Amino acid sequence: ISEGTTLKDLIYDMTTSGSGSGLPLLVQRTIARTIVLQESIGKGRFGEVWRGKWRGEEVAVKIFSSREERSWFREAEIYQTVMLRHENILGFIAADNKDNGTWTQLWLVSDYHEHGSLFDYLNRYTVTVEGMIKLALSTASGLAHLHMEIVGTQGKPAIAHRDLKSKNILVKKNGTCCIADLGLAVRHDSATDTIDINHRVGTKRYMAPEVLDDSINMKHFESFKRADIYAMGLVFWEIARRCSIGGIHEDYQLPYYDLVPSDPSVEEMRKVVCEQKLRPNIPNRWQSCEALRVMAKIMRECWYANGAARLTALRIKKTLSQLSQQEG
Ligand SMILES: COCc1cccc(-c2c(-c3ccc4nccnc4c3)n(C)n(C)c2=O)c1
């Protein structure tokens, strides 16, 4: 990296230099070791997330606990599986490791987003009929691109998030989104039928029925995709539940807030979800706007106690991409 070089220069050189490959490790190494950390900006599942600048340009750094190294590798590994890059998927910049033994430091660097997580966004905000769609349409677009299975040269294998939720989604300045945190992600090769990975992972609350009650067929890939959809549905709930059509809107709430306690359990969920077959209360008066209803329609077609019945990211993308046309 010679003088004058900017992150902007590095990103461009990559996203236009043959293979969808990232920057050379050597370069990633340099970037990481020269990032100037600003301050911590979040914790969670595995590792604390910091805000940092490289030669001035903001950037996001996810510093891992030496103990959660597996999550570290899975992300780095998965993002470096051909052209995973995508407008609706968090942009990988570099991955690095320093020190050794008990004090090994593992870092992942990504793009920075002032607006932060969809979760922190929906909390301190009230979206419009407009945005409510950009947010969902994009989340959909992304999940669609992840589950997609571009076969061929630099095509991408099928990918299942396994931990999709509001905290793992970020929003940009123009109101779009992008999935994040592939720590649990799972690849699936079609030319050999496989899946590099393995218990009951992911955030309890957003867990789908087939997983909560343990019966999910981990041998069939689609099964995972199905679980993603169910979650994305809970996410859509969170979004619209915060839309504001004429001053009217409900306080931000996590799925199953009024049912299960704060920070649920695998047992406390198997109850409210599997058995009692309960889903986020779709506001009655939610049948005002045509689009606002299209959502609930989908939300219902995602929460089916049967994975096989639920829609698909692609489909959801289409009907949403459509609503984008007519509405607004
Ligand atoms: C390959 O890089 C992965 C990576 C690096 C740094 C942070 C994150 C990350 C973020 C993230 C990403 C960008 C941000 N920009 C501004 C403020 N916070 C951010 C958090 N979130 C919300 N989660 C769950 C993550 O794993 C992922």
General description of the model:
The chain folds into two domains: 1-114, Phosphorylase Kinase, domain 1, CATH 3.30.200; 115-328, Transferase(Phosphotransferase) domain 1 (Transferase(Phosphotransferase), domain 1). The chain has ten helices and nine strands. It has helices at residues 7-14, 25-34, 69-79, 118-123, 129-147, 209-212, 222-240, 266-275, 290-300, 313-326, and strands spanning 36-40, 48-54, 57-64, 92-98, 105-110, 158-160, 169-171, 177-179, 186-188. The strands form three sheets. A five-stranded antiparallel β-sheet has the order 1-2-3-5-4. A two-stranded antiparallel sheet has the order 6-9. Strands 7-8 form a two-stranded antiparallel sheet. It is globular, with a radius of gyration of 20 Å. Bound molecules: the ligand COCc1cccc(-c2c(-c3ccc4nccnc4c3)n(C)n(C)c2=O)c1. Ligand JZO is lined by residues 41, 49, 60-62, 75, 79, 90, 92, 108-110, 112-113, 116-117, 167-168, 170, 180-181.
From the 3D structure, determine the CATH topology of the largest domain.
Transferase(Phosphotransferase), domain 1
* SS elements, strand count: 9
Helix percentage? 25-40%
H/E series, N to C?
A: HHEEEHEEHHEEEEHHHHH
Structural class of the secondary structure composition? alpha+beta
CATH superfamily of the largest domain: Transferase(Phosphotransferase) domain 1
How many helical elements?
10
CATH architecture of the largest domain: Orthogonal Bundle
Distance between the termini: 45 Å
The CATH class of the largest domain is Mainly Alpha
Shape: globular
Could you tell me the strand content as a percent range? 5-15%
Bound molecules: the ligand COCc1cccc(-c2c(-c3ccc4nccnc4c3)n(C)n(C)c2=O)c1
Overall radius of gyration:
20 Å
Give me the side-by-side strand order of the main sheet.
1-2-3-5-4
Q: What profile does the largest beta sheet have?
A: 5 strands, antiparallel
PDB class: transferase
Keywords: kinase, tgfbetari, structure-based drug design, protein-inhibitor complex, Aortic aneurysm, ATP-binding, Craniosynostosis, Disease mutation, Disulfide bond, Glycoprotein, Magnesium, Manganese, Membrane, Metal-binding
Assembly: monomeric
Entry title: Crystal structure of TGFbRI complexed with a pyrazolone inhibitor
